[PDB]
Amino acid sequence: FNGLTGTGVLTESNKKFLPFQQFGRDIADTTDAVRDPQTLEILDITPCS
């Protein structure tokens, strides 16, 4: 996503990103959730099992 490389599972979520917010971060600044740059929708990033 816009050069942010990672491995995980993209699922539909309910985390209301603010309109100026593009990336979400965890405690250890791992990418928790992203907004898709094409369609303005919200997705979690859960790393694979």
């Binding site: 405690i27 250890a28 600044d29 791992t30």
Partner: protein, 48 residues
């Protein structure tokens, strides 16, 4: 005496502080270990 111990355990939350401190210390160690991934350590970024 058994009833008094029951009332004391129901009323005082600091009676089991000897176990609560162990659980809290484990939580602090785990949280510190997680949060140490956010440090740059002199590099350009903390994200691999």
């Amino acid at each position: 005496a058994i009833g008094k111990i029951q009332d004391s355990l129901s009323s005082t939350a600091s009676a089991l502080g000897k176990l609560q401190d162990v659980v809290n210390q484990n939580a602090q160690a785990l949280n510190t270990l997680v949060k140490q991934l956010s440090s740059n350590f002199g590099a350009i970024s903390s994200v691999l």
